[PDB]
């Protein structure tokens, strides 16, 4: 059990080609375990902006409209406290029975746009179904992805799904996340998409990975192995990227620049990573 402090930042610049509405998701989330000490959102030129959330409330969206032949920039900066628990997984030998799951966990057993878990049940069972420990099973999924999918910039696009990546064997963090989720759900393990800022991510960027519901806790997993698991600051969780796009654009516009940063404010940061030989899960709670 540890508490961490971070300073996060993103800014994005767009050239707008025709009348365009934007929905962004860059704000740190406020949860019981994650607190924002201070934040600031600035757009230049100054355009009216509104924050809203879905009923689920696991992301903070901001929306605005911009007129044609125009450019603007949005800058977000915040100081955030996170905490996590490291939870022993030794006795995680059966999934929480479906009849006992909280009502709001249930949707995370179901297929979603980028996570066609209903097409991967036999595959997931053939590959991972013999692994008795639930945590070990999800970890094996994550290790299989790391070892069998190449991390290749530009190999995929926003249409790419888990069902594609499982045969294409190339992708980026969004695709690694969707694939882990689909394989978990295929084994009846609730799983959700997680986006955030990531300390030590190089080159710095928004990051996507996932959480699996094991023994009553959401446990973080990241098949890319790009980032220490304790360096993440949560932006959103949801079913998949459909619920957590950095920017949804209704109109014609493209980004001309983007910067993302996450810095620790703790003096002596020590990275946490998973290992096959250790039955310990990290949970943001």
Q: Return d(Cα 228, Cα 237) in angstroms, integer.
A: 18
Q: Which two tokens stand for residue 189?
A: 């393990």
150 contacts a copy of itself (rule: CB under 8 A):
yes
Please report, as residue ranges, which positions from 217 to 246 form the binding site for a copy of itself (by CB under 8 A): 242-243
Residue 16, H or E segment: strand 2-16
151 vs 272 by CB, closer to a copy of itself? 151
Chosen residue from 40, 53, 254, 257 binding a copy of itself by CB under 8 A: 53
The minimum distance between CB 169 and a copy of itself, in angstroms, equals 4
Question: What ranges in 6-161 are assigned the alpha helix state H?
Answer: 121-128, 134-148
99 contacts a copy of itself (rule: CB under 8 A):
yes
Place of tokens 């960027």: 205
How are beta strands 280-283 and 70-88 bridged, if at all? antiparallel
Place of tokens 């069972």: 125
Q: Which two tokens stand for residue 27?
A: 């704000």
55 contacts a copy of itself (rule: CB under 8 A):
yes
Q: Return d(Cα 198, Cα 213) in angstroms, integer.
A: 21
Measured between alpha carbons, how far apart are the two ends of the chain, in Å?
A: 9
Please report, as residue ranges, which positions from 69 to 88 form the binding site for a copy of itself (by CB under 8 A): none
The minimum distance between CB 45 and a copy of itself, in angstroms, equals 17
The minimum distance between CB 103 and a copy of itself, in angstroms, equals 4
Stretch that binds a copy of itself, among 54-62, 194-202, 216-224, 226-234 (CB under 8 A): 54-62
Stretch that binds a copy of itself, among 76-84, 111-119, 173-181, 218-226 (CB under 8 A): 111-119
140 contacts a copy of itself (rule: CB under 8 A):
no
Q: Return d(Cα 213, Cα 105) in angstroms, integer.
A: 8
186 vs 262 by CB, closer to a copy of itself? 186
169 contacts a copy of itself (rule: CB under 8 A):
yes
Cis peptide bond prior to 45, omega within 30° of 0? yes
CA distances in angstroms from 232 to 68, 114, 209, listed in the order given: 36, 23, 10
Please report, as residue ranges, which positions from 171 to 210 form the binding site for a copy of itself (by CB under 8 A): 188
- Which residues form the interface with a copy of itself (CB under 8 A)? 21, 23, 50, 52-56, 61, 63-65, 97-99, 103-104, 106-107, 109-113, 115-116, 118-120, 122-123, 126-127, 148, 150, 158-159, 163, 166-170, 188, 242-243, 248, 250
């Amino acid at each position: 059990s540890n508490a961490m402090k971070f300073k996060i930042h993103s800014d994005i610049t767009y050239q707008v080609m025709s009348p365009t509405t934007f929905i962004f998701n860059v704000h740190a989330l406020r949860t019981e375990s994650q607190h924002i000490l201070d934040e600031s959102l600035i757009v230049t030129p100054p355009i009216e902006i509104e924050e809203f959330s879905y009923n689920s409330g696991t992301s903070r969206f901001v929306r605005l409209k911009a007129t044609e032949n125009t450019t603007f920039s949005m800058s977000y900066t915040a100081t955030v406290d996170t905490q996590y628990k490291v939870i022993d997984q030794r006795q995680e030998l059966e999934t929480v029975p479906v009849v006992d799951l909280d009502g709001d966990i249930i949707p995370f057993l179901f297929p979603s746009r980028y996570c066609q878990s209903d097409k991967l049940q036999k595959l997931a069972y053939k590959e991972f179904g013999k692994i008795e420990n639930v945590y070990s099973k999800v970890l094996a999924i994550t290790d299989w992805i790391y070892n069998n999918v190449e991390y290749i910039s530009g190999s995929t696009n926003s249409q790419t799904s888990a069902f594609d990546t499982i045969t294409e064997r190339a992708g980026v963090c969004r695709d690694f996340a969707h694939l882990g989720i689909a394989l978990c759900r295929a084994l009846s393990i609730p799983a959700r998409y997680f986006t955030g800022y990531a300390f030590k991510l190089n080159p710095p960027d928004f990051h996507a990975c996932f959480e699996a519901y094991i023994g009553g806790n959401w446990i973080i997993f990241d098949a890319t192995r790009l980032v220490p698991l304790n360096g993440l600051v949560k932006i959103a969780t949801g079913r998949d990227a459909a619920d957590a796009a950095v920017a949804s654009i209704f109109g014609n516009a493209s980004s001309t620049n983007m910067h993302v940063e996450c810095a620790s404010l703790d003096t002596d940061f020590t990275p946490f990573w998973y290992d096959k030989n250790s039955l310990k899960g990290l949970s943001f709670q």
